[PDB]
Amino acid sequence: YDLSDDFFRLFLDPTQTYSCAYFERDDMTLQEAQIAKIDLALGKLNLEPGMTLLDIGCGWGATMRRAIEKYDVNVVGLTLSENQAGHVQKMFDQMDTPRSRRVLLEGWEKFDEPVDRIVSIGAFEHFGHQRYHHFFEVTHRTLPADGKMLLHTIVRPTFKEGREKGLTLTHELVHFTKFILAEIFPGGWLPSIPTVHEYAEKVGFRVTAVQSLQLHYARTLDMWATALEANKDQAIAIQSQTVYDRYMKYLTGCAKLFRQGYTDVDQFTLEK
Ligand SMILES: Nc1ncnc2c1ncn2[C@@H]1O[C@H](CSCC[C@H](N)C(=O)O)[C@@H](O)[C@H]1O
């Protein structure tokens, strides 16, 4: 099965956002910084009341809930997670708004409905390079003439290794990376910036904006680690020491990587 949600609730903030947060103010709590990230991403889609927003890889729904409440738009979210689909539908059934709200347990490969805007945060890393062209073709064909998509994903730093770029690449990296791709992003892939640009532009997309959040991810990871650690006993009771150590190793290790510049997190604004 998939890792139990009661496990995730041991380190994620209340909204259950599972992606790099945005510390607009350094004093923000994790929940405040995750709400800040949602507003940052959505603010770029120039949302207007009555529009329809597609959330590709919606997780537990915080982004779509925010879109409805703060921006007053209709939403639709796709996820591959059984637990999330059910959780988001229950969420949807509990709230009251004349806004349409739909959640679907299916990949972006099967979605083919016209929407006004698209947002995808932390999903792209799970797609795998071989499907990139398809993803951009599908998202580009569902968007309108004035459509835009906000693609938020982990990326590999560009060639700056010269006169900079901790040119170290061996063990205390290579091995960990295999660990990350095997345990954290099974069948996934971390793209280079040139690659994102490559496939996006090849379907007609114009990359009109890019924003890096490198150091915000390091602090997000630190906070998830601190929370998991404080809830160690409960984490081990619900799952196991193996899973616990697995995640602590992931969180603490990646925090170091983004902090040292080995990896980055970018938000790409793409216009049809
Ligand atoms: N091919 C695919 N199609 C649709 N959703 C996918 C997908 N591959 C991964 N996902 C989804 O993308 C999400 C990654 S975790 C991020 C969740 C949410 N965007 C947040 O910011 O918290 C999960 O919901 C996962 O099920």
Swiss-Prot record:
Compartments, as annotated in UniProt: Cytoplasm
CDD domains reported for this sequence: AdoMet_MTases (cd02440)
One Pfam family cited in the UniProt record for this chain: CMAS
GO biological processes: lipid biosynthetic process; methylation
Annotated GO MF terms: cyclopropane-fatty-acyl-phospholipid synthase activity
Annotated S-adenosyl-L-methionine binding sites: 18-19, 53-61, 79-84, 108-109
Catalytic site: C254
SUPFAM superfamilies in the cross-refs: S-adenosyl-L-methionine-dependent methyltransferases (SSF53335)
The keyword Methyltransferase is annotated on this UniProt entry: yes
Entry keyword set: Cytoplasm, Lipid biosynthesis, Lipid metabolism, Methyltransferase, S-adenosyl-L-methionine, Transferase
Reactions it catalyzes: a 1-acyl-2-(9Z)-enoyl-sn-glycero-3-phospholipid + S-adenosyl-L-methionine = a 1-acyl-2-(9-cyclopronane)-acyl-sn-glycero-3-phospholipid + S-adenosyl-L-homocysteine + H(+)
Gene Ontology cellular component list: cytoplasm
EC assignment: 2.1.1.79
Pathway annotation: Lipid metabolism; mycolic acid biosynthesis
Enzyme type, top EC level: transferase
Similarity-based family: Belongs to the CFA/CMAS family.
SUBUNIT field: Homodimer.
Described purpose of this protein according to its UniProt entry: Involved in the phagosome maturation block (PMB). Catalyzes the conversion of a double bond to a cyclopropane ring at the proximal position of an alpha mycolic acid via the transfer of a methylene group from S-adenosyl-L-methionine. It can use cis, cis 11,14-eicosadienoic acid and linoelaidic acid as substrate. Cyclopropanated mycolic acids are key factors participating in cell envelope permeability, host immunomodulation and persistence.
PANTHER family the record matches: CYCLOPROPANE-FATTY-ACYL-PHOSPHOLIPID SYNTHASE (PTHR43667:SF1)
Name of this protein: Cyclopropane mycolic acid synthase 3
